[PDB]
Write a protein that binds this ligand. Structure first.
Ligand SMILES: [Mg+2]
Ligand SMILES: [Mg+2]
Ligand SMILES: [Mg+2]
Ligand SMILES: [Mg+2]
Ligand SMILES: [Mg+2]
Ligand SMILES: [Mg+2]
Ligand SMILES: [Mg+2]
Ligand SMILES: [Mg+2]
Ligand SMILES: [Mg+2]
Ligand SMILES: [Mg+2]
Ligand SMILES: [Mg+2]
Ligand SMILES: [Mg+2]
Ligand SMILES: [Mg+2]
Ligand SMILES: [Mg+2]
Ligand SMILES: [Mg+2]
Ligand SMILES: [Mg+2]
Ligand SMILES: [Mg+2]
Ligand SMILES: [Mg+2]
Ligand SMILES: [Mg+2]
Ligand SMILES: [Mg+2]
Ligand SMILES: [Mg+2]
Ligand SMILES: [Mg+2]
Ligand SMILES: [Mg+2]
Ligand SMILES: [Mg+2]
Ligand SMILES: [Mg+2]
Ligand SMILES: [Mg+2]
Ligand SMILES: [Mg+2]
Ligand SMILES: [Mg+2]
Ligand SMILES: [Mg+2]
Ligand SMILES: [Mg+2]
Ligand SMILES: [Mg+2]
Ligand SMILES: [Mg+2]
Ligand SMILES: [Mg+2]
Ligand SMILES: [Mg+2]
Ligand SMILES: [Mg+2]
Ligand SMILES: [Mg+2]
Ligand SMILES: [Mg+2]
Ligand SMILES: [Mg+2]
Ligand SMILES: [Mg+2]
Ligand SMILES: [Mg+2]
Ligand SMILES: [Mg+2]
Ligand SMILES: [Mg+2]
Ligand SMILES: [Mg+2]
Ligand SMILES: [Mg+2]
Ligand SMILES: [Mg+2]
Ligand SMILES: [Mg+2]
Ligand SMILES: [Mg+2]
Ligand SMILES: [Mg+2]
Ligand SMILES: [Mg+2]
Ligand SMILES: [Mg+2]
Ligand SMILES: [Mg+2]
Ligand SMILES: [Mg+2]
Ligand SMILES: [Mg+2]
Ligand SMILES: [Mg+2]
Ligand SMILES: [Mg+2]
Ligand SMILES: [Mg+2]
Ligand SMILES: [Mg+2]
Ligand SMILES: [Mg+2]
Ligand SMILES: [Mg+2]
Ligand SMILES: [Mg+2]
Ligand SMILES: [Mg+2]
Ligand SMILES: [Mg+2]
Ligand SMILES: [Mg+2]
Ligand SMILES: [Mg+2]
Ligand SMILES: [Mg+2]
Ligand SMILES: [Mg+2]
Ligand SMILES: [Mg+2]
Ligand SMILES: [Mg+2]
Ligand SMILES: [Mg+2]
Ligand SMILES: [Mg+2]
Ligand SMILES: [Mg+2]
Ligand SMILES: [Mg+2]
Ligand SMILES: [Mg+2]
Ligand SMILES: [Mg+2]
Ligand SMILES: [Mg+2]
Ligand SMILES: [Mg+2]
Ligand SMILES: [Mg+2]
Ligand SMILES: [Mg+2]
Ligand SMILES: [Mg+2]
Ligand SMILES: [Mg+2]
Ligand SMILES: [Mg+2]
Ligand SMILES: [Mg+2]
Ligand SMILES: [Mg+2]
Ligand SMILES: [Mg+2]
Ligand SMILES: [Mg+2]
Ligand SMILES: [Mg+2]
Ligand SMILES: [Mg+2]
Ligand SMILES: [Mg+2]
Ligand SMILES: [Mg+2]
Ligand SMILES: [Mg+2]
Ligand SMILES: [Mg+2]
Ligand SMILES: [Mg+2]
Ligand SMILES: [Mg+2]
Ligand SMILES: [Mg+2]
Ligand SMILES: [Mg+2]
Ligand SMILES: [Mg+2]
Ligand SMILES: [Mg+2]
Ligand SMILES: [Mg+2]
Ligand SMILES: [Mg+2]
Ligand SMILES: [Mg+2]
Ligand SMILES: [Mg+2]
Ligand SMILES: [Mg+2]
Ligand SMILES: [Mg+2]
Ligand SMILES: [Mg+2]
Ligand SMILES: [Mg+2]
Ligand SMILES: [Mg+2]
Ligand SMILES: [Mg+2]
Ligand SMILES: [Mg+2]
Ligand SMILES: [Mg+2]
Ligand SMILES: [Mg+2]
Ligand SMILES: [Mg+2]
Ligand SMILES: [Mg+2]
Ligand SMILES: [Mg+2]
Ligand SMILES: [Mg+2]
Ligand SMILES: [Mg+2]
Ligand SMILES: [Mg+2]
Ligand SMILES: [Mg+2]
Ligand SMILES: [Mg+2]
Ligand SMILES: [Mg+2]
Ligand SMILES: [Mg+2]
Ligand SMILES: [Mg+2]
Ligand SMILES: [Mg+2]
Ligand SMILES: [Mg+2]
Ligand SMILES: [Mg+2]
Ligand SMILES: [Mg+2]
Lengths: 212, 72, 119, 185
RNA sequence: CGGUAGGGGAGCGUUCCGUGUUAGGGAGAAACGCGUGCGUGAGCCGCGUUGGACGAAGCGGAAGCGAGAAUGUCGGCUUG
RNA sequence: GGCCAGUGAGACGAUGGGGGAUAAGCUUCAUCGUCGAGAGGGAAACAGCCCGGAUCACCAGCUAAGGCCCCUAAAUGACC
RNA sequence: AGACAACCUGGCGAACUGAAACAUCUUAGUAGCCAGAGGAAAAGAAAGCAAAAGCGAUUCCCGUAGUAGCGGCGAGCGAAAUGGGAGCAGCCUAAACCGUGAAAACGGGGUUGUGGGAGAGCAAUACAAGCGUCGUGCUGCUAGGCGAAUCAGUGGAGUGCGGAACCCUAGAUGGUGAAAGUCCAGUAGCCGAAAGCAUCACUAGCUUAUGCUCUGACCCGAGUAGCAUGGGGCACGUGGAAUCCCGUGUGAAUCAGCAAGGACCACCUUGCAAGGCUAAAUACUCCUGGGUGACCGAUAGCGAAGUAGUACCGUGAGGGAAGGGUGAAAAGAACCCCCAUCGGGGAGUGAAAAGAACAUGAAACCGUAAGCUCUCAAGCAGUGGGAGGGGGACCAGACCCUGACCGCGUGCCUGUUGAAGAAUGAGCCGGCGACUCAUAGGCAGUGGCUUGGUUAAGGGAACCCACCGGAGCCGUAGCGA
């Protein structure tokens, strides 16, 4: 690797160095690849809930000139249409699905490019799981500030484990995301200010996405 | 279940495609009144001719599943 | 996502209307009329920026003609100009018209040079 | 040079903005939208059939139906997966290796679909093989097995599935063989 | 380097989403009114003895996205 | 060759002709010009005649067709 | 018995339309009507597929495939088998025979298919499996309860700002004079049900049950199958027209049989019609409870934010509108004056009068005041030139308003060979108002992989999404009916 990574113990002293080496998008297309990967994500996340009534859903037509003036909806000699108030909506939204597709390998590429950009931030950690027994948020934040994470700026903890105490201890900070590999999004990696890995985690990422 | 385009069947019993991808058809006029057509003519009307570039549009538009190189 | 047209209309209209200030009658009121009237204004304007260049030459030439005809019985615009040229002077018609009104003695001098040399 | 949600953006040329017809003339196709004046092509709704010329008898109609199709003679269908020796050369076959069908899915040179799944294999001469390979297929072209037996390769031809023949026609086809046999001996 | 039908290239704006529970905002936001300001233009930027709480720029995404014509259509107000 | 449009009512003028009455701003063809889709000047006004093909600015200059008594730019010029 | 939105099953069953006309065909067994039942319905335990290798009731999705085919071979219609998933479940009865009757019935026995059963003899017997009153059980639902942590300053109000602190298994949400993790109700977490409901286990009990040998004589669903005709439906339009189901008429065979394998015959394979019943996977929203929203915000969203199916209109079936925002709080203006009331002007309330026809308040339209200007004048009302007069400036030679007179100047749109047209259209102003979406085919531009590329349905810490899912599909051989 072209850069080391600091490994800090639970106190915050630097114990070691690691290397996270991934498949990177060629320099030209990176911004496109990632971009696309992101767009796709956000677009599949979308639920078309916007619904209208077409000209034929609208209640209570009959085909005829109106016999008497409906104040605001029509006048005396007029024909039924979309062009009234209360008329159908021409080309209005119907419930959709926005779901598009992207190649698996392209996906993974975006993920890798993202995380391989984020190596100017990232730490590693000595796998703190045991130091939490009773869930304590106060404690988690203590630990954070020891590692130099401002409990403001939106950081990402990528671990293998969800140890219940840790899981709950982090639940209520708005700026943390605690990710298993089961939930790992391009989105959150892009979104995070600081990246945090464990040893097992680096071992995982450097394998799945390893450059040959 | 979407809608996939339907092959126009009356055009696909008429035209086909050669291995290199060009469209061909039969020639019209050998079925009857043969006696009065000279044998040289009768031979000419028996072979397979490549369809006239002009028609390619209509043809192509009605046979969406036919693999066709227009030589680009 | 429904989109009302909102103000995007009335800004355009208002910015048009500003143009049409001081048009008599309904050319200063109704938007629909005001539109047309704006176009025609801009149009005549463009036209007469071109007419202009024709017109002042018209004028200047006329004034020059009058200014010279005072001197000789037989003398013209045409004769004059011809002589300005066979004497190699560059003064164009704006300048001779302005010197005709604003410094008449000067034009008399010029004429005296042209005559002396044509003599 | 780090990626965030804000430094992202597309590649020039990728997403090209769409024509929105019927807005303004200065823009694009305004008014008419690029349909010109009137008539049937500029009218809303389903057009006329794609193969239809004006009522003059359409090209596809005035031309005679293709030979076999025209009557309902069943169309021709590939009955073997053809492989030439080219492909077998290119692939990673070391000597002694069994070619067969399976070992060509393994190295992926043939990816068969449903119809092709159910099919047998056939070997067609093209390209000059250099190696001794053990081949198993249901058929060969003449040229094929000529070049193969020339190179020193063992050609194992696989049994096709038996055709069920009723007893009487066995008696006939066997009566034949009895005749040939009594004659030669 | 005139230009209709028509084709191609480059842009502006509207509402909404991501960044974002953003910058900014009862020391006055949106809007409304103004400009000796800047644009090829769509428009932008600045200003307010109006207004009273929201909401830019940038880099991206999506459309119920731009009106002067439809004997359009609904309200309002004229003329006679 | 690919992708992908409109057009498929034309008008007059010059020339060659046919129909008609060597009638029609008539009608129908042929080789051209302009209008269509072309602004400017000359034609009193005046799609199709003459000059000329308008990127834009200039209170500069030279010319085309056409003009030089006054309306209205230039000779109330010269010689037959 | 009646009621019941959509879905479903059965019964009747169109037409515009498409075919650039139309009659076969299409629309479409759609709409509509009628009847019926359910939370789903229907279908369903091989007289089935297939092809010489195998599968093992039904339904639903992906795929095969717009393939084979059908078709005035026109418009169009359009499979299945293999393959991948979801989901799984198999049972009662007739007849032979044995009892009881005169019957008709009842009771035992008996239910299968590379055959069973009845018949005649000899062996095994105890476990296993299915159903289920009663009842404390388990869980959930129908009320609830406990629930951490802040202060002062700042112009009506502080949740904002500057400055200090704190909780977090709680930084969901709503409210509060102004935007709040720490003010209220709440949330995480944790407790809680006398009564009823629901899924589950258990629950006495009720059910069933094996094994072999001999015997082609007994049974194995009759007005049935088939056949002749008339039709219907199967992707399949009478076609060589199978399989399926009905009118009229005829009319079999029992396992040494009968049916199916796309006329038909032979052979082989597969199966057992003419008795029933069955859960799930799938469809739907008059609704109920949670949740999300690149959904609306009073011309929108339901027709309906107020008497909304109301007012009103119609004999009747039926049609069918409009009217939202004083303020934080009514503190909704005591008292005096004009004064018959309404309405107003003061005072008082209030941050503001925002004063009840009350929040921002554009345009048309109606005026009032101030600056310049029109009564010898011909004009799509402008424009270039600018006399005279006036106004706010800081680059005072500029800007802004007015406009003596001269020049030039045939509204806009549509549509036409061609228009100022006496050609169409618009009273004016503001809103609403049109190349949209889904799915496929072709082409282009961008990426990704090219150790060929890619997955579909499906599964997913709810979605998204990691990771799966190679069934398929595209490219690797053509020629030929
Ligand atoms: Mg209707
Ligand atoms: Mg509506
Ligand atoms: Mg090929
Ligand atoms: Mg023949
Ligand atoms: Mg074409
Ligand atoms: Mg909106
Ligand atoms: Mg609109
Ligand atoms: Mg003016
Ligand atoms: Mg589009
Ligand atoms: Mg364009
Ligand atoms: Mg227009
Ligand atoms: Mg077009
Ligand atoms: Mg039109
Ligand atoms: Mg056309
Ligand atoms: Mg049509
Ligand atoms: Mg249609
Ligand atoms: Mg069609
Ligand atoms: Mg034929
Ligand atoms: Mg072939
Ligand atoms: Mg293939
Ligand atoms: Mg041009
Ligand atoms: Mg154009
Ligand atoms: Mg903007
Ligand atoms: Mg804006
Ligand atoms: Mg906005
Ligand atoms: Mg802020
Ligand atoms: Mg402002
Ligand atoms: Mg806004
Ligand atoms: Mg602006
Ligand atoms: Mg901008
Ligand atoms: Mg406020
Ligand atoms: Mg922004
Ligand atoms: Mg719309
Ligand atoms: Mg209007
Ligand atoms: Mg009206
Ligand atoms: Mg009036
Ligand atoms: Mg013609
Ligand atoms: Mg014609
Ligand atoms: Mg036409
Ligand atoms: Mg002519
Ligand atoms: Mg002529
Ligand atoms: Mg001649
Ligand atoms: Mg004559
Ligand atoms: Mg003639
Ligand atoms: Mg003519
Ligand atoms: Mg000429
Ligand atoms: Mg035209
Ligand atoms: Mg031209
Ligand atoms: Mg001209
Ligand atoms: Mg002229
Ligand atoms: Mg010329
Ligand atoms: Mg030129
Ligand atoms: Mg030019
Ligand atoms: Mg000259
Ligand atoms: Mg003169
Ligand atoms: Mg003379
Ligand atoms: Mg009932
Ligand atoms: Mg009833
Ligand atoms: Mg019911
Ligand atoms: Mg019909
Ligand atoms: Mg009809
Ligand atoms: Mg028709
Ligand atoms: Mg028709
Ligand atoms: Mg169900
Ligand atoms: Mg049922
Ligand atoms: Mg079974
Ligand atoms: Mg059975
Ligand atoms: Mg299957
Ligand atoms: Mg399964
Ligand atoms: Mg099963
Ligand atoms: Mg019995
Ligand atoms: Mg029994
Ligand atoms: Mg058998
Ligand atoms: Mg047997
Ligand atoms: Mg027995
Ligand atoms: Mg409490
Ligand atoms: Mg509390
Ligand atoms: Mg405070
Ligand atoms: Mg604070
Ligand atoms: Mg809150
Ligand atoms: Mg709770
Ligand atoms: Mg037997
Ligand atoms: Mg029959
Ligand atoms: Mg039939
Ligand atoms: Mg049949
Ligand atoms: Mg059958
Ligand atoms: Mg079959
Ligand atoms: Mg029937
Ligand atoms: Mg019968
Ligand atoms: Mg019998
Ligand atoms: Mg039969
Ligand atoms: Mg069978
Ligand atoms: Mg039976
Ligand atoms: Mg049957
Ligand atoms: Mg049965
Ligand atoms: Mg049933
Ligand atoms: Mg209203
Ligand atoms: Mg409404
Ligand atoms: Mg409003
Ligand atoms: Mg009072
Ligand atoms: Mg009284
Ligand atoms: Mg009073
Ligand atoms: Mg007061
Ligand atoms: Mg007070
Ligand atoms: Mg108001
Ligand atoms: Mg007079
Ligand atoms: Mg006067
Ligand atoms: Mg006048
Ligand atoms: Mg004038
Ligand atoms: Mg005039
Ligand atoms: Mg006409
Ligand atoms: Mg008019
Ligand atoms: Mg016209
Ligand atoms: Mg006309
Ligand atoms: Mg109108
Ligand atoms: Mg009118
Ligand atoms: Mg009218
Ligand atoms: Mg629109
Ligand atoms: Mg279209
Ligand atoms: Mg689309
Ligand atoms: Mg496409
Ligand atoms: Mg590529
Ligand atoms: Mg999936
Ligand atoms: Mg799922
Ligand atoms: Mg899903």
């Amino acid at each position: 690797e072209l850069i080391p990574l600091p490994i800090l113990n639970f106190s915050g002293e630097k114990v070691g160095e690691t290397f996270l080496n991934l498949k990177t998008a060629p320099s030209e297309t990176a911004r496109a690849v990632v971009h696309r990967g992101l767009i796709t994500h956000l677009q599949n996340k979308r639920r078309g809930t916007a619904s209208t009534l077409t000209r034929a859903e609208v209640r209570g037509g009959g085909r005829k000139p109106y016999p008497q003036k409906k104040t605001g909806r029509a006048r005396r000699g007029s024909q039924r249409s979309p062009l009234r108030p209360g008329g159908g909506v021409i080309f209005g939204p119907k419930p959709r699905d926005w779901t598009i597709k992207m190649n698996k390998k392209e996906r993974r590429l975006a993920l890798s490019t993202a995380i391989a950009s984020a190596v100017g931030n990232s730490f590693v950690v000595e796998e703190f799981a045991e130091n939490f027994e009773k869930p304590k948020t106060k404690d988690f934040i203590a630990a954070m500030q020891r590692w130099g994470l401002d409990p403001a700026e939106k950081s990402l903890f990528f671990l293998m484990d969800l140890v219940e105490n840790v899981e709950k201890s982090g639940r209520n900070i708005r700026t943390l995301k605690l990710l298993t590999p089961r939930s790992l999004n391009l989105f959150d990696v892009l979104n995070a200010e600081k990246l945090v890995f464990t040893e097992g985690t680096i071992q995982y990422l450097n394998q799945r996405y390893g450059v040959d | 279940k979407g809608y996939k385009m339907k092959t126009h069947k009356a055009s696909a019993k008429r035209f086909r495609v050669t291995g290199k991808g060009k469209i061909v058809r039969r020639r019209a006029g050998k079925q009857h009144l043969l006696a009065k057509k000279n044998t040289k003519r009768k031979n000419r009307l028996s072979k397979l001719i490549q369809v006239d570039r002009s028609d390619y549009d209509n043809v192509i538009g009605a046979l969406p599943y036919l693999k066709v190189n227009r030589k680009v | 996502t429904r989109v009302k047209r909102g103000y995007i209309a009335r800004r355009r209209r208002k910015k048009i209307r500003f143009f049409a200030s001081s048009f008599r009658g309904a050319h200063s009121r109704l938007t629909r009329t005001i539109a047309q009237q704006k176009i025609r204004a801009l149009v005549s304007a463009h036209r007469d920026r071109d007419r202009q260049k024709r017109d002042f030459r018209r004028l200047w030439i006329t004034r020059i003609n009058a200014a010279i005809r005072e001197r000789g019985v037989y003398y013209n615009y045409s004769k004059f100009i011809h002589d300005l040229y066979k004497r190699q002077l560059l003064l164009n018609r704006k300048i001779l018209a302005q010197i005709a009104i604003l410094n008449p003695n000067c034009i008399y001098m010029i004429y005296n040079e042209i005559i002396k040399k044509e003599d | 040079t780090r990626f965030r949600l804000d430094n992202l953006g597309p590649q020039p040329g990728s997403r090209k903005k769409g024509k929105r017809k019927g807005r303004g003339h200065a823009a694009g196709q305004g008014g008419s939208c690029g349909f010109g004046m009137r008539g049937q092509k500029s009218r809303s709704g389903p057009g006329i059939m794609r193969g239809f010329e004006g009522g003059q008898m359409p090209l596809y109609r005035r031309i005679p139906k293709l030979r076999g199709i025209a009557g309902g003679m069943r169309a021709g269908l590939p009955k073997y997966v053809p492989i030439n020796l080219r492909d077998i050369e290119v692939a990673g076959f070391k000597e002694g290796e069994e070619v067969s069908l399976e070992s060509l899915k393994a190295k992926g040179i043939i990816n068969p679909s449903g119809r092709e799944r159910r099919l047998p294999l056939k070997i067609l001469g093209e390209g000059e093989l250099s190696t001794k390979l053990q081949i198993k297929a249901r058929a060969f072209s003449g040229s094929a097995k000529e070049k193969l037996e020339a190179a020193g390769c063992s050609v194992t031809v696989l049994p096709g599935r038996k055709k069920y023949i009723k007893e009487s026609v066995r008696k006939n086809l066997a009566r034949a063989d009895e005749y040939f046999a009594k004659k030669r001996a």
